[PDB]
Write a protein that binds this DNA or RNA. Structure first.
Lengths: 163, 144, 133
RNA sequence: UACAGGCGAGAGACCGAUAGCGAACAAGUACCGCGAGGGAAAGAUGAAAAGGACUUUGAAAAGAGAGUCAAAGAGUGCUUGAAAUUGCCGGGAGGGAAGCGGAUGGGGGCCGGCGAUGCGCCCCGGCCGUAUGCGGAACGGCUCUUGCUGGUCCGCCGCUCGGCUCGGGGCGUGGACUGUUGUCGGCCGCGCCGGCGGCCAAAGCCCGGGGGCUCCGCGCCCCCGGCAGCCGUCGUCGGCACGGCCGGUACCCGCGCGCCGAAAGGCGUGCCCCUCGGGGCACUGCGCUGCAACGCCCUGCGGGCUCCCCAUCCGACCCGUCUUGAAACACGGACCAAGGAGUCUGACAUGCGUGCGAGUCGACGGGUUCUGAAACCUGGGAUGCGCAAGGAAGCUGACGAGCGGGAGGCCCUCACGGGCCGCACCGCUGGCCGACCCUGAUCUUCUGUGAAGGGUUCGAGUUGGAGCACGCCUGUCGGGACCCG
RNA sequence: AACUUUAAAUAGGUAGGAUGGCGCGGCUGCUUCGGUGAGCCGUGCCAUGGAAUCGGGUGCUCCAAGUGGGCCAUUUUUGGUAAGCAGAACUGGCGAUGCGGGAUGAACCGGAAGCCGGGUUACGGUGCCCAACUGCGCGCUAACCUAGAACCCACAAAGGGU
RNA sequence: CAACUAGCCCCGAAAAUGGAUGGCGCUGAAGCGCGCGACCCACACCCGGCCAUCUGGGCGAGUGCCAUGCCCCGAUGAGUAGGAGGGCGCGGCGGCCGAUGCAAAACCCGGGGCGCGAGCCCGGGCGGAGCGGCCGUCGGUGCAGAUCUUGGUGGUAGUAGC
RNA sequence: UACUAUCCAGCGAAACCACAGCCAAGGGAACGGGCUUGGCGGAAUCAGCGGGGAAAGAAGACCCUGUUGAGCUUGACUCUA
RNA sequence: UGAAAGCGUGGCCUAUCGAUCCUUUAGACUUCGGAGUUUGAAGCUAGAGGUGUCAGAAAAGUUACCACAGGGAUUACUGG
RNA sequence: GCCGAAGUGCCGCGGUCGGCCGCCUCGAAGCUCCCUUCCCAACGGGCGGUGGGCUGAAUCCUUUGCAGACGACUUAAAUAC
RNA sequence: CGACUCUCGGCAACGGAUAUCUCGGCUCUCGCAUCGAUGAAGAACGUAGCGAAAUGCGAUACCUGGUGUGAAUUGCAGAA
């Protein structure tokens, strides 16, 4: 018909619960979020749903360093929602406690975080006790950083004049 | 349309460098020498990662010094430290420990932020000028 | 609801029948539809009279998909165990005796099927297998 | 440590007679070529030959009978016996007629299908019995030592009653594919009729007045004031008469629930306008979405499907390829069966998945075994966890970062918004490190040292890492490498 | 055209604000003979509010296929007598386009196409072919040396006729 | 009476296979110019029904289970090169379930039925020993061609001929 | 005038074939058996025939191109008996 | 240079030029690897010696004795 | 008797006979049983009943030469110029 | 109006596909060492009652001694 009309038909489609979701535990967890979100007022739990949909190859590991650094008395020991996993490459003995909830924890993290304080909470519990999703920060995690933006291949991706 | 000697991409990765261009390296030869004689390994391996496990690292044995203030030869704690002349350790991220690393070369000044007792000593062998005139003495402890 | 949808499917028909082009004059060239890949085909260009192409829009109502014209959903029934599943449906599903099954085993399927009250095509298939026109 | 020969063995997600080796069979045979060399085709009756005696026709080969067989629709054309082609015959069609071979419509020809025949009620016949007591148990909520409330069921006796099902009898309602007709609602067209206003309203006619033209006068014109009147065009509203199509409205579309009235339809009351005829306006909750009729379901027949004839139509020749364009006076293709071409690998990129994660990767190996496995385990080595140089090397890379937009959360506010914390991520400005260049304290084995302050230089860095292993698709390279030349 | 004082139209660029402005007060090796100024930081104030209109959402990143011979028409235009020619400029098509129209036609015209019923049109028609007024109205035309009859398009002129 | 203006008609206007307003024919046209109505009319437009795709919802509290389900939306859909998506069929392998000499597989069938299709299902006939479905796994995995390869068989043709 | 053809009895191929076969003009890959429009429109056929099927045989031998060869020549490049 | 403020990184502006290799030149720096010393050599950084098919192969003819892959992208020939 | 054509049909007469709401009656307007044209004319054919009548052609082998590729053409022979 | 031209079915003929078979191939893996002038590898031509072939053998010729097994060989004949 139109080219204008075709413009509406060629729209977006990011959209996907991931091409293959092998993990049954991931798959049931997103169903739990799916049920609660439409039965609650929570913008925050809706954001969680997207980050656990499309990819796992995008979910960022977050070290104990920097997790500690943004809860520095300007967040009074809330709940840290970590999309990917906690990793343990630091020793400071961090914050004297903190309740950290995540999708996955490393085995080292399970021991380390709880023996610094608080409790390693599961995302099942996050959904249970906060479908409301309040007093909460999705703490952080980067992959956009120095290594592996477009910095790929063999010899990266450059200052930029020619490549 | 294809005949896979066009869009397949020619045969060989030349003509992309040959007369065409983009990618890789350009302006090639730098220094040359050394041959198969003068060869492998000058190691640099950070002290900070062992400094994490310095506190609980009485598995590289402490002796007269305290449990917390721990003698550790870092040479035999670092895997593949062996074929290189010296490993000197960098301090990235803070260390809050009273560890003691023995090295064959040190990034000394490195010692100053964990000055809270650290033991940075030189490696007799680091000198080179020690008299093995048969005699006896210095070397470095080791493992793979 | 269900009844006018059945009427729409059966009476209208898109039994167009998707014949391959030049199937008629080349015997080996198959009756089965395959999409004209070349630009040069009239069928590809969508000339009318050259046999219209299969598209989704030709498709029937969702409810009336894979239904027998009785408005029963057809199920090929292999053995006695599978009849129990059909029993739940009754009216909605049909029993049709499989090709593999031989004549003696057909009889036990028929008598059980009668109890479920899903007599249609099940009995008919068996009767031929006995000896009958 | 090797092993595509030889000999003697064990196996495979091997191949299944155009495949597999050249060769399953007399195969390196037959055959081809002067030679060097080239090199096939070719497996299957059946359990057992029980491989058709005998009779008859025919010169014989064969045939026909018969015998045999579980089967000759198994007779050494031998299990099954596809396509093509050929024969017979049947059907359609027709010997007055034009062919892309099909689609579209109708008829023939051919054939399968079509609730077991439905419901309410009562009478007889038939069978069983609950409640409650008894007697034996799987259960429940739960508690969970322990406790209390709730079980149902079967055995089958007691004590009182009653019910159901198959068939028949007896009455009322009427259900069986499929085709047809009536209707309500929605949508759309259809022709026709009527009103008001706009356009100072005026064509118009009667009455009245003046002028011009004509100057032969009739007549013609023009204007102005009173008037039935009716007009073309613009806008709007109003009313009818019919039909197509779709659907029967399966939750707020529509509507009933007291009464009369075949019926449709109407029947409260207050208010206000009109104050006439009538009107508008207010006032309860539930339940719930298809109505009338005809044929027959079996007799019999609607129908579906194929060919044909007639009707109708794009018919660029049929497809593929090449090409700007293929029907092409481009190229290939008589027809059909069976082969027949993006594969597999090593090393790679991305994506996606899986594990574990500052690590990660068992399997060179060793232990062990139910044995090419599986299980177990070692130090690692490889890759990463820091870099940057050509190299020597590097105070030696730990002091540690802001800003703007930022999801989301927090706080306030009824909300709108405001404030607070701010991730992902993005952009930007710095510091730090190496290479490069300056700066060079206190010190010092005599030139080392590197505090300290900087730089239109440069890096695949740090400034708060992410990898590694395995796999799959696709891309990439070496390989015969999509197939063929 | 390779001249221009002059000088269009259609094209083309920029701006029309919270990615902004203003107040407060900090630093500098700059800049000022001078805190004079400049830039950049903290903190405060001002919303629909900065023409119109729209966003059946947009912004952003990675990676890979095909393409790498184009062809045509209207318009503009250079070479050439010209050409269905060779070569540019703009745009739409074909290529990747049937269907309807132009008798017929890859590109013109109309319109981009799911599957159908019913309505209604476009282009183009209404004597018959061929669905549809031999309808109404007002002219012109009588063609023996080619009557006339639909863009592109199937050609056609100077010049002549009491 | 003369010179003009511009309509149609006439001349200028001559080619070859016979011929083309497409044809017939048409003269108060069915011509030519023009007006006015009515009317005809594309896969376009509208309304309704319906398909998938995309978008937004919604409904799992378990104890009928596809929740990658089901249900309500509205808009959109040509499509070569090409990409991605979701399926179908075959062979074999691990699992699981079925079928059989009282007739398996195979093959035949102007016989029925399903699915948009890929294909599937079932009946009858032929046949005589093993096979298929479903869940995973894997390929020497699907044909119409290739002046294709190999086998069979036509028309040519009972003809050239001998 | 012989021997054929022809006609017979016997015997019996091949080339070749997308599907086939009546013209005219039109447009169109710009020269049609097929489309479009007109004209037409013998079953079933044989002997002939050389217009046509741009008939068939032969990936045009020419001509151009390919980063394709080979024969030859030399004052090519580079080596050498 | 000019009083200075200023101006000057060739020519008033628009053309007038050149990869890696290798050599050459400068830098007294690095390395020659079992340690030194010294010749010599090799590196790094910035110039020069140059490819005019000028983003940069190392190249002369003939073929009617010709061959092969393709082409109507293309000639000679018909038609338009 | 006419129309010669492509007359093949038309027109005139006279009874006989059917039909005639032409006119008048009877039971009756009901015989396709309460929408399903429900076939209804007759150009033609099929098929019986019965009253007549027609009493053969053609083709093969053979032959002629008038004629011919072969059919065919054109002659001849069955009881007689 | 037979016929012809065409089409299909049913039954066939044609043909050897398909299915189902397979004392075979194929490929991997394992064990093993072991030719000859002391006449080999390879060939030729003969020999079986009736044999063309393959297989076996060499004038001691489809075989011999010895040994194992313990009654067949077979198409027919035959020895007993």
């Amino acid at each position: 018909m139109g080219i204008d009309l075709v413009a509406g038909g060629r729209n977006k489609r990011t959209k996907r619960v991931a091409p293959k979701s092998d993990d049954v535990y991931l798959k049931l967890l997103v169903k739990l979020y799916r049920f609660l979100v439409r039965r609650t007022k929570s913008k925050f739990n809706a954001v969680i749903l997207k980050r656990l949909f499309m990819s796992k190859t995008n979910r960022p590991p977050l070290s104990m360093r920097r997790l500690s650094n943004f809860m520095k008395g300007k967040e009074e020991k809330n709940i840290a929602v970590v999309v990917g996993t906690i990793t343990d490459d630091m020793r400071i003995q961090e914050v004297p406690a903190m309740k950290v909830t995540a999708l996955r924890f490393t085995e080292t993290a399970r021991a380390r975080i709880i023996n610094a304080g608080g409790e390693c909470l599961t995302f099942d519990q996050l959904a249970l006790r906060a479908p409301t999703g309040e007093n909460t920060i999705l703490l952080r995690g980067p992959k956009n950083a120095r290594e592996a933006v477009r910095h790929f291949g063999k010899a990266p991706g450059v200052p930029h004049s020619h490549t | 349309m294809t005949t896979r000697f066009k869009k397949n991409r020619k045969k060989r990765g030349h003509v992309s460098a040959g007369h065409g261009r983009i990618g890789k390296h350009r302006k090639h030869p730098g220094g040359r020498g050394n041959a198969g004689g003068m060869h492998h390994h000058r190691i640099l391996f950070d002290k900070y990662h062992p400094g994490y496990f310095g506190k609980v690292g009485m598995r590289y044995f402490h002796r007269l010094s305290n449990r917390f203030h721990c003698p550790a030869v870092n040479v035999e704690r670092l895997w593949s430290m062996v074929p290189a002349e010296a490993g000197a350790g960098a301090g990235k991220a803070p260390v809050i420990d009273v560890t003691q690393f023995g090295y064959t070369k040190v990034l000394g000044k490195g010692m100053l932020p964990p000055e809270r007792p650290i033991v940075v000593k030189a490696k007799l062998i680091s000198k080179v000028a020690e008299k093995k005139i048969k005699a006896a003495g210095g070397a470095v402890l080791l493992t793979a | 609801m269900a009844v006018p949808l059945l009427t729409k499917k059966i009476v209208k028909k898109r039994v167009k029948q998707f014949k391959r082009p030049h199937s008629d004059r080349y015997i080996g060239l198959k009756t089965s539809w395959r999409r004209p890949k070349g630009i040069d085909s009239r069928v590809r260009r969508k000339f009318k009279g050259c046999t219209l192409m299969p598209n989704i829009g030709y498709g029937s109502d969702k409810k009336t998909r894979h239904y027998l014209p009785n408005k029963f959903k057809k199920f090929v029934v292999h053995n006695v165990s599978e009849l129990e599943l059909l029993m739940m449906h009754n009216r909605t599903y049909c029993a049709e005796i499989a090709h593999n099954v031989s004549t003696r085993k057909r009889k036990e399927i028929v008598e059980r099927a009668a109890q479920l009250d899903i007599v249609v095509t099940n009995k008919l298939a068996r009767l031929r297998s006995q000896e009958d026109e």
